Design a protein around this ligand. Structure first.
Ligand SMILES: CCCCC/C=C\C/C=C\CCCCCCCC(=O)O
Lengths: 49, 48
């Protein structure tokens, strides 16, 4: 519903969502997604698991 | 101005949006299951 939606907001009215009670296994995105820019700031990405 | 000791050359083809994954810490589809670089690398990366 987040990465695979149908319409995204307008940057002047950007959306904001809340996530709770779920499992963060992002390895499901490897099959279909393809990101050009991905940058984490206060955390190393090798420890998101 | 230098001389080099133990020179090896790797070579492969990937997709553009994965070149950022060819680096010490990147944790993606290419860095996890296909090809990973040490955390104390000494060398040079080259893409085109
Ligand atoms: C639904 C949001 C859940 C948020 C959970 C909190 C932190 C998760 C952090 C990052 C998840 C996305 C990382 C991108 C996947 C690696 C890049 C790739 O695809 O190759």
């Amino acid at each position: 519903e987040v990465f695979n939606a149908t319409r995204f907001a307008s940057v002047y009215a950007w959306n904001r969502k809340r996530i709770s009670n779920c499992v963060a296994d992002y390895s499901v995105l490897y099959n279909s997604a393809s990101f050009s820019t991905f940058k984490c700031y206060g955390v190393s990405p090798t420890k998101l698991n | 101005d230098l001389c080099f000791t133990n020179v090896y050359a790797d070579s492969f083809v990937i997709r553009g949006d994965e070149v950022r994954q060819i680096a010490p810490g990147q944790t993606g589809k290419i860095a996890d299951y296909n090809y990973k670089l040490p955390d104390d690398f000494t060398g040079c990366v080259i893409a085109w």
